Amino acid sequence: NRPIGSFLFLGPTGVGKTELCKALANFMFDSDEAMVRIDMSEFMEKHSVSRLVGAPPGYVGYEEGG
Amino acid sequence: QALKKYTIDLTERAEQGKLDPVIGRDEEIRRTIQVLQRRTKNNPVLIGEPGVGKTAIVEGLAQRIINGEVPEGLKGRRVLALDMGALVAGAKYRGEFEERLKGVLNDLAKQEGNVILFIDALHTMVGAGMDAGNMLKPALARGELHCVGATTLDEYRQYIEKDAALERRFQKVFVAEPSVEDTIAILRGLKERYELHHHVQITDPAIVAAATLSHRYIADRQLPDKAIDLIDEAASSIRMQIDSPEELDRLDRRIIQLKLEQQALMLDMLNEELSDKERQYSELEEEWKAEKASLSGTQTIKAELEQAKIAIEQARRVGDLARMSELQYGKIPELEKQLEAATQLEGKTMRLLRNKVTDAEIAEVLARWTGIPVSRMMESEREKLLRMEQELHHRVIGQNEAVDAVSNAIRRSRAGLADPNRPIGSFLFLGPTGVGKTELCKALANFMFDSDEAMVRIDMSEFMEKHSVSRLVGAPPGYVGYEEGGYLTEAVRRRPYSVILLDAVEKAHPDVFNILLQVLDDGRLTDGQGRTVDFRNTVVIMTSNLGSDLIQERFGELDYAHMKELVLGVVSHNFRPEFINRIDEVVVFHPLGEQHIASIAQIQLKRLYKRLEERGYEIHISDEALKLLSENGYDPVYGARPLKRAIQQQIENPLAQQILSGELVPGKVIRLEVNEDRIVAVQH
Amino acid sequence: DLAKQEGNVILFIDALHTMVGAGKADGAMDAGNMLKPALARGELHCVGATTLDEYRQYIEKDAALE
Amino acid sequence: NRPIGSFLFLGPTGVGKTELCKALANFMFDSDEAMVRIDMSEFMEKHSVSRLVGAPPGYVGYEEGG
Amino acid sequence: DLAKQEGNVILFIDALHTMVGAGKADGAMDAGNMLKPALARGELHCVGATTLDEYRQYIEKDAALE
Amino acid sequence: AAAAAAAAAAAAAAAAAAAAAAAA
Numbered sequence: 001n002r003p004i005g006s007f008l009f010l011g012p013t014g015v016g017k018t019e020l021c022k023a024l025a026n027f028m029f030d031s032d033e034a035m036v037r038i039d040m041s042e043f044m045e046k047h048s049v050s051r052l053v054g055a056p057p058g059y060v061g062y063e064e065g066g
Numbered sequence: 067q068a069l070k071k072y073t074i075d076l077t078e079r080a081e082q083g084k085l086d087p088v089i090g091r092d093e094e095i096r097r098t099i100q101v102l103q104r105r106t107k108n109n110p111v112l113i114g115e116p117g118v119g120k121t122a123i124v125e126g127l128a129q130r131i132i133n134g135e136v137p138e139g140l141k142g143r144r145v146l147a148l149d150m151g152a153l154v155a156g157a158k159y160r161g162e163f164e165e166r167l168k169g170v171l172n173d174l175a176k177q178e179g180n181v182i183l184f185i186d187a188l189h190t191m192v193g194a195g196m197d198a199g200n201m202l203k204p205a206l207a208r209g210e211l212h213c214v215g216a217t218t219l220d221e222y223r224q225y226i227e228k229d230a231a232l233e234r235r236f237q238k239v240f241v242a243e244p245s246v247e248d249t250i251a252i253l254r255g256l257k258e259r260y261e262l263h264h265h266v267q268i269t270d271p272a273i274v275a276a277a278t279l280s281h282r283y284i285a286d287r288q289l290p291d292k293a294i295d296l297i298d299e300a301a302s303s304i305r306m307q308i309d310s311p312e313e314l315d316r317l318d319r320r321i322i323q324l325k326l327e328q329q330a331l332m333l334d335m336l337n338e339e340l341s342d343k344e345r346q347y348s349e350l351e352e353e354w355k356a357e358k359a360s361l362s363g364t365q366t367i368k369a370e371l372e373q374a375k376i377a378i379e380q381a382r383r384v385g386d387l388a389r390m391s392e393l394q395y396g397k398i399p400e401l402e403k404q405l406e407a408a409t410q411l412e413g414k415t416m417r418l419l420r421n422k423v424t425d426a427e428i429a430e431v432l433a434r435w436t437g438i439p440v441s442r443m444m445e446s447e448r449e450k451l452l453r454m455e456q457e458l459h460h461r462v463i464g465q466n467e468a469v470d471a472v473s474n475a476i477r478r479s480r481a482g483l484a485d486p487n488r489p490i491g492s493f494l495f496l497g498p499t500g501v502g503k504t505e506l507c508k509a510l511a512n513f514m515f516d517s518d519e520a521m522v523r524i525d526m527s528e529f530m531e532k533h534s535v536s537r538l539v540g541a542p543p544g545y546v547g548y549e550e551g552g553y554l555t556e557a558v559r560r561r562p563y564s565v566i567l568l569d570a571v572e573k574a575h576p577d578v579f580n581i582l583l584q585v586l587d588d589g590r591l592t593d594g595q596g597r598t599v600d601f602r603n604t605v606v607i608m609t610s611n612l613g614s615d616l617i618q619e620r621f622g623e624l625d626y627a628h629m630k631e632l633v634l635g636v637v638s639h640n641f642r643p644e645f646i647n648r649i650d651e652v653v654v655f656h657p658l659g660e661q662h663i664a665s666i667a668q669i670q671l672k673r674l675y676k677r678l679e680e681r682g683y684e685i686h687i688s689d690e691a692l693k694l695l696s697e698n699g700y701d702p703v704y705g706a707r708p709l710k711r712a713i714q715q716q717i718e719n720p721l722a723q724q725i726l727s728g729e730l731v732p733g734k735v736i737r738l739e740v741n742e743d744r745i746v747a748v749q750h
Numbered sequence: 751d752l753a754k755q756e757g758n759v760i761l762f763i764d765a766l767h768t769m770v771g772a773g774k775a776d777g778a779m780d781a782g783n784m785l786k787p788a789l790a791r792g793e794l795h796c797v798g799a800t801t802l803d804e805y806r807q808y809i810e811k812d813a814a815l816e
Numbered sequence: 817n818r819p820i821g822s823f824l825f826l827g828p829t830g831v832g833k834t835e836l837c838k839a840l841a842n843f844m845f846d847s848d849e850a851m852v853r854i855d856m857s858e859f860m861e862k863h864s865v866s867r868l869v870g871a872p873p874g875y876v877g878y879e880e881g882g
Numbered sequence: 883d884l885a886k887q888e889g890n891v892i893l894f895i896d897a898l899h900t901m902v903g904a905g906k907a908d909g910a911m912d913a914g915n916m917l918k919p920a921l922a923r924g925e926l927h928c929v930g931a932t933t934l935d936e937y938r939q940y941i942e943k944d945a946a947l948e
Numbered sequence: 949a950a951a952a953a954a955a956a957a958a959a960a961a962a963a964a965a966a967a968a969a970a971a972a
């Protein structure tokens with residue numbers, strides 16, 4: 001009932017965090033660009049909620065989801 | 067003559083008695099007669115919702131012609147049901163539909179008001195190729211045709227009031243939705259009719275139950291169609307219960323099992339046991355046949371009584387003199403008293419079944435027809451339901467308050483005592499997390515359905531924006547997802563008895579709480595298309611933790627009462643005063659303790675045993691290892707899931723680390739012993 | 751023909767919502783108008799079989815055949 | 817020149833407002849809910865007039881009316 | 883005629899969504915509700931071909947032929 | 949002589965959209 005693992009990494013920048021994740025992807029599929037990367041620093045307002053989960057019925061980009 | 071070839075003589079069916087005598091529709095039959103006895107616009111067309119008797123009025127009119135009780139201007143008329151089917155079905159070549167239509171109108175013109183035209187299903191006429199409207203739209207408002215259409219409310223708007231001149235060629239006759247007690251009387255006359263057909267008896271509490279239940283629970287269809295749905299269905303079901311039995315099949319499985327056993331053994335004693343059980347089975351069989359034969363003779367004399375009533379009404383039509391007093395004073399009292407003699411004979415000899423239809427049977431039909439559980443408190447579910455809190459502490463330890471509350475909720479549903487304006491439980495949970503809000507609701511779903519995620523599980527943390535109102539409701543017309551409809555109301559009107567979790571409710575912009583103002587207040591909600599959904603058989607539950615500081619501060623040294631009061635003040639800080647009045651019960655969770663943590667430890671261990679038993683491996687645990695898990699899974703602020711992370715790491719990492727190592731063997735008990743401060747895994 | 755078999759025949763339709771709007775043409779006969787009286791008075795014994803989806807979309811729009 | 821009772825009710829919460837309206841419905845028509853209970857807690861947006869009134873032609877729910 | 887072929891023929895269709903919306907006229911019958919029976923039994927050895935987005939828009943609208 | 953043959957008569961309907969502002 002929970003997803004496989006949900007980790008909160010920490011640190012200062014440039015120590016390898018993104019590389020650990022890309023090392024996982026380049027392990028698990030032999031690809032860095034086969035993963036899901038949601039660049040969460042964009043989300044400085046409360047809308048991009050409605051870009052990642054989709055926009056409800058009666059709105060603009062309805063039939064293409066998040 | 068096209069009238070032989072292209073209509074239905076309804077006056078012959080009423081003459082040959084193929085119809086239902088309609089009780090009621092007094093004003094509307096008299097309205098039909100008013101509108102038919104005019105000079106221009108001699109055309110009413112019955113309009114109501116589908117179900118309320120738009121065929122019934124025309125058949126009751128037709129019988130009143132046969133009964134001759136009409137006003138004198140309608141004596142000697144004819145009622146012909148115009149067949150759009152054959153009149154289109156011949157029309158292969160050019161002009162044939164129009165030629166047959168013209169010839170129909172000329173033949174009806176030759177009868178000169180002798181024949182009242184009855185179009186059934188008026189919107190079938192219009193599109194037939196000019197072609198179908200503009201041939202008759204002249205002839206309609208000239209008095210020469212007395213048409214009575216009969217069609218639905220919707221097809222009036224969508225297939226008639228388009229072409230407005232065809233609309234003014236008529237008169238609306240607004241057939242009403244029938245009321246409660248009028249439906250009861252209609253059902254009494256038809257009770258006599260279904261006791262002609264389905265070979266059973268019908269009780270009067272069955273009548274008041276069918277009226278009360280069809281008006282109360284179901285929303286979709288209407289009186290008196292759905293009360294007839296109940297009565298006719300229960301007639302067929304009780305026909306099947308007489309026709310089938312459970313004890314006979316129990317004894318049949320027993321005798322065939324002992325026969326197979328004795329055939330395998332060929333000390334004995336089983337020849338004697340099988341002889342005794344075959345004798346008992348034949349005795350219950352012969353009782354079953356005798357009971358069926360008694361009810362059969364009862365129904366034959368019931369039907370011959372009814373045909374005597376039909377023949378004496380044929381005498382009241384014709385006027386035979388000795389036939390009246392003869393049939394009355396002979397056939398009515400002796401056949402009624404031996405009908406009652408067969409009835410009390412049933413009351414004596416029916417042991418093994420039901421000969422009637424009562425409110426128990428209507429309730430059983432209704433629950434197995436929709437899915438609202440309003441059937442009577444059968445014993446096994448009553449024992450389960452009395453063991454509510456025995457079961458709920460097998461997925462939620464502690465937290466007895468809301469355990470009791472939802473116990474009360476399910477009881478006051480099933481006992482029927484609840485207020486039928488409102489849903490069963492509009493609960494609302496508080497308390498800082500890690501304590502079992504989501505789990506109490508999951509335990510409810512498994513309790514009520516034997517399924518964990520079979521619940522309309524809205525998750526409120528998406529509704530921070532002002533428009534996922536129209537996520538859940540539906541999309542209003544003209545817009546994109548009109549043809550879908552929402553996710554809440556559609557998934558409730560599929561299954562009218564389910565539990566709407568509202569996980570994490572404080573996240574939203576409070577417009578969703580206006581939608582829930584309707585929901586929790588009166589249990590109707592309007593979907594996008596406009597067709598309402600009744601929530602009065604659902605348990606709307608919302609979880610939140612808007613009291614984290616408060617209950618973590620003061621659950622000790624305080625009661626439950628001032629606890630509730632102070633956190634109710636805190637919800638009044640957040641939520642709206644319009645809304646927390648609508649709550650069924652604001653309940654307050656509280657942080658767990660050490661016996662509770664030990665319990666949850668054992669529960670996670672048991673489900674882990676199940677998982678590795680699906681792997682196929684056996685596990686014991688040291689009690690000191692349980693002390694490790696207890697002191698590694700304890701804290702005030704985070705609640706349960708510290709225990710789950712401690713279990714997860716400090717078991718599953720070295721364990722499965724050893725598993726795919728191939729160190730471990732299928733067949734040994736994986737005993738969990740301890741090191742100094744770590745669990746050691748042994749294989750012996 | 752099924753009137754000439756006297757209830758010996760239980761009719762079966764799979765995918766009931768092929769019937770609402772079956773052959774509506776210059777003659778809008780629809781095969782719903784024609785089945786509606788026989789379905790009312792129970793003269794046939796027709797068992798449908800439809801998806802829960804299209805029961806909403808294609809049959810609850812034709813309310814008399816509901 | 818106006819509809820008959822152009823009323824607007826106010827006050828504190830839960831004090832028989834909807835009750836009075838159902839009390840009229842029980843009076844006038846002997847039915848508790850036989851009254852058009854259009855609920856202004858759905859219409860928190862612009863397009864909700866197109867919910868309750870109807871649809872302009874050519875578009876989706878135009879033939880169903882409001 | 884493919885039932886005549888005694889199960890020795892493999893059917894290939896490109897743009898299966900086109901076949902789903904092929905004969906779908908206003909109150910008619912498409913190939914979708916005609917290949918509903920011959921594919922749940924599967925005497926017709928179909929082979930599909932589609933784009934990922936328009937699979938999602940088009941065929942997953944029709945769950946039975948999904 | 950011939951017969952008035954039945955037709956097929958493909959028809960179509962449309963959709964609006966809706967765009968929504970933010971207050972701030």
Ligand SMILES: Nc1ncnc2c1ncn2[C@@H]1O[C@H](COP(=O)(O)OP(=O)(O)OP(O)(O)=S)[C@@H](O)[C@H]1O
Pocket residue numbers: 011012013014015016017018019020
């Ligand atoms: N341990 C490492 N091994 C290999 N390459 C590394 C390592 N640490 C840093 N790098 C390189 O330096 C880059 C910086 O690492 P990142 O993880 O992307 O930075 P960061 O620590 O994730 O902080 P962010 O994500 O930029 S906020 C990587 O993309 C690699 O190119």
Ligand SMILES: Nc1ncnc2c1ncn2[C@@H]1O[C@H](COP(=O)(O)OP(=O)(O)OP(O)(O)=S)[C@@H](O)[C@H]1O
Pocket residue numbers: 086087088089090091115116117118119120121122123216217218252256290291294786790814
């Ligand atoms: N007053 C009544 N007396 C007896 N039976 C009635 C009465 N009103 C309705 N019914 C029954 O209701 C059923 C049909 O009722 P209607 O109001 O005619 O619905 P309907 O007209 O058949 O619906 P459509 O759209 O016209 S097919 C039949 O079983 C009738 O016997």
Ligand SMILES: Nc1ncnc2c1ncn2[C@@H]1O[C@H](COP(=O)(O)OP(=O)(O)OP(O)(O)=S)[C@@H](O)[C@H]1O
Pocket residue numbers: 461462463464465498499500501502503504505570609610611666669705706707710
């Ligand atoms: N009383 C309890 N009995 C058994 N398991 C429990 C209990 N309380 C919590 N748990 C466990 O804790 C998890 C559920 O945590 P919750 O208390 O439900 O968090 P929550 O109630 O959903 O509140 P939030 O909003 O999620 S923090 C599940 O894994 C349960 O097994």
Ligand SMILES: Nc1ncnc2c1ncn2[C@@H]1O[C@H](COP(=O)(O)OP(=O)(O)OP(O)(O)=S)[C@@H](O)[C@H]1O
Pocket residue numbers: 587644828829830831832833834835836
């Ligand atoms: N004078 C009264 N007589 C009988 N019941 C009353 C009276 N005043 C209030 N009530 C009860 O108060 C409740 C009112 O429900 P509602 O009409 O929704 O509330 P309201 O007070 O009229 O306004 P809202 O919509 O709830 S804020 C019902 O349960 C009534 O029984």
